[PDB]
Amino acid sequence: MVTTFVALYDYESRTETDLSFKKGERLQIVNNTEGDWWLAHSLSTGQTGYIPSNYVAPSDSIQAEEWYFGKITRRESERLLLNAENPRGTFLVRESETTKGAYCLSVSDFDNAKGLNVKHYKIRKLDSGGFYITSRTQFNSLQQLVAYYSKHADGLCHRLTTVCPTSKPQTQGLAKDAWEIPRESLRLEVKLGQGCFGEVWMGTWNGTTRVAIKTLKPGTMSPEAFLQEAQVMKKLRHEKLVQLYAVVSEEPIYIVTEYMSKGSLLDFLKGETGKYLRLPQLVDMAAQIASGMAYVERMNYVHRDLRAANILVGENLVCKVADFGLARLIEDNEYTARQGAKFPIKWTAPEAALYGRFTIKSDVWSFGILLTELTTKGRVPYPGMVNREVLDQVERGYRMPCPPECPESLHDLMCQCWRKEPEERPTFEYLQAFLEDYFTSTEPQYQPGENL
Numbered sequence: 228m229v230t231t232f233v234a235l236y237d238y239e240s241r242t243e244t245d246l247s248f249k250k251g252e253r254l255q256i257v258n259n260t261e262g263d264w265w266l267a268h269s270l271s272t273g274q275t276g277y278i279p280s281n282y283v284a285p286s287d288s289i290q291a292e293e294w295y296f297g298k299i300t301r302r303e304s305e306r307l308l309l310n311a312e313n314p315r316g317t318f319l320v321r322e323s324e325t326t327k328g329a330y331c332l333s334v335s336d337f338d339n340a341k342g343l344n345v346k347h348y349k350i351r352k353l354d355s356g357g358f359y360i361t362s363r364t365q366f367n368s369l370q371q372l373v374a375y376y377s378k379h380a381d382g383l384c385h386r387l388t389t390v391c392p393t394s395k396p397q398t399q400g401l402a403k404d405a406w407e408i409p410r411e412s413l414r415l416e417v418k419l420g421q422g423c424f425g426e427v428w429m430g431t432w433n434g435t436t437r438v439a440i441k442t443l444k445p446g447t448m449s450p451e452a453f454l455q456e457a458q459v460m461k462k463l464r465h466e467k468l469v470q471l472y473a474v475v476s477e478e479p480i481y482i483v484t485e486y487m488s489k490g491s492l493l494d495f496l497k498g499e500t501g502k503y504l505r506l507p508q509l510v511d512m513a514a515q516i517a518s519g520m521a522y523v524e525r526m527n528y529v530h531r532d533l534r535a536a537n538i539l540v541g542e543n544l545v546c547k548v549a550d551f552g553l554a555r556l557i558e559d560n561e562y563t564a565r566q567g568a569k570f571p572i573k574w575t576a577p578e579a580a581l582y583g584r585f586t587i588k589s590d591v592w593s594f595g596i597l598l599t600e601l602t603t604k605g606r607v608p609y610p611g612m613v614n615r616e617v618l619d620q621v622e623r624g625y626r627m628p629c630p631p632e633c634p635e636s637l638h639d640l641m642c643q644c645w646r647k648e649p650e651e652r653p654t655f656e657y658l659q660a661f662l663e664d665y666f667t668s669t670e671p672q673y674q675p676g677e678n679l
């Protein structure tokens with residue numbers, strides 16, 4: 228059907244105007260003139276958006292079939308079919324190397340004594356239009372031949388089970404949306420920092436707006452992985468979260484956000500202003516962070532990297548949640564976490580660190596640890612304890628004690644955040660209200676000392 232295409236691979240949406248689809252999905256594309264990105268409309272979901280043109284095939288063509296591998300050699304088909312995880316009966320169809328115009332069905336098999344091997348069955352074509360492996364069983368299409376042998380082996384080594392898996396190709400360039408800006412609209416002014424994955428600058432946007440510009444060093448993480456952070460920030464908008472302004476999706480990749488003039492909360496606490504802060508100021512900062520996290524909570528997201536180093540500060544003790552580089556929408560299943568997500572370990576709840584169960588409740592644990600950073604003015608959690616020993620201690624019941632000059636009621640709040648069972652930890656909704664009302668509802672007799 229001309230203008231109908233079939234997806235060869237899965238594609239996940241990563242902008243506001245691209246289209247998610249699954250392999251085998253049928254899509255209308257009425258202008259396939261060119262570019263590497265085509266406007267498509269799904270005949271399954273009725274959704275419209277842009278798709279990578281190398282991920283689809285015309286619906287008429289044999290190339291639309293997932294099991295059709297075209298012109299590959301006998302030996303290359305074997306290499307693909309002998310993948311360690313393929314079930315017995317994994318298969319593909321390809322051109323025959325030995326008979327012009329014929330095809331070949333190649334199938335993974337298993338010898339109980341000798342192990343994995345591949346069998347090949349030549350598919351010949353008649354003048355009548357038929358296809359066959361054996362003369363007695365003919366079909367009008369490769370599709371019907373495959374369908375039949377997926378029901379019964381009928382002479383083959385095994386019934387056809389699984390279509391041979393293969394590598395998904397990269398898209399040609401990244402999908403872009405209305406957050407994209409021309410790089411000429413930016414001037415880099417002051418370099419704020421740098422690390423293994425790039426740099427952060429203070430700059431100006433459109434000649435008028437002060438911004439922070441996070442840059443990706445090429446050859447480190449993928450542009451897609453880097454921009455996951457911007458994808459999250461397009462959806463999460465709140466006064467106590469750092470705001471996304473724009474992206475530049477060609478190398479070097481930029482993420483452009485609002486600029487927070489005082490830098491990280493950790494450095495702010497350790498610096499000269501920390502000496503002049505007392506409990507009311509620190510609790511107010513905690514409440515602001517809790518308000519941001521209560522929004523993240525309501526929106527069904529998880530941050531996964533909450534700590535004072537990832538809060539940013541402005542004038543007048545304004546605090547905002549930042550660094551959404553690990554943040555995720557919560558899904559009702561498990562996933563294999565990256566080895567790096569659990570670090571730094573002193574902020575990570577045991578069930579997140581041990582089993583990869585990162586939830587809003589593991590963010591609550593991290594918030595409790597953040598409360599210790601506030602009340603000690605930036606001391607490292609678990610002082611005297613090396614990173615390698617922390618998990619075992621916490622698992623066995625060890626909790627940090629009440630910091631000097633910290634009211635017992637605030638340490639009791641920290642301890643609730645560190646409950647062994649995640650469900651027994653408070654919500655950020657509760658934490659925000661508690662901290663906002665602290666000096667009227669909880670400590671109405673408070674008087675400052677020299678530190679808190």
Ligand SMILES: CN1CCN(Cc2ccc(C(=O)Nc3cccc(Nc4nccc(-c5cccnc5)n4)c3)cc2)CC1
Nearest residue numbers: 419420421422427439441484485486487488489490491539
């Ligand atoms: C161990 N690790 C090694 C690599 N290193 C890189 C680094 C170091 C310092 C800063 C900093 O002081 N930033 C700073 C200073 C003054 C103001 C701001 N303001 C600001 N405003 C908005 C966004 C951002 C920002 C910061 C970091 C990442 N992305 C956005 N920063 C930032 C930023 C990045 C971090 C530590």
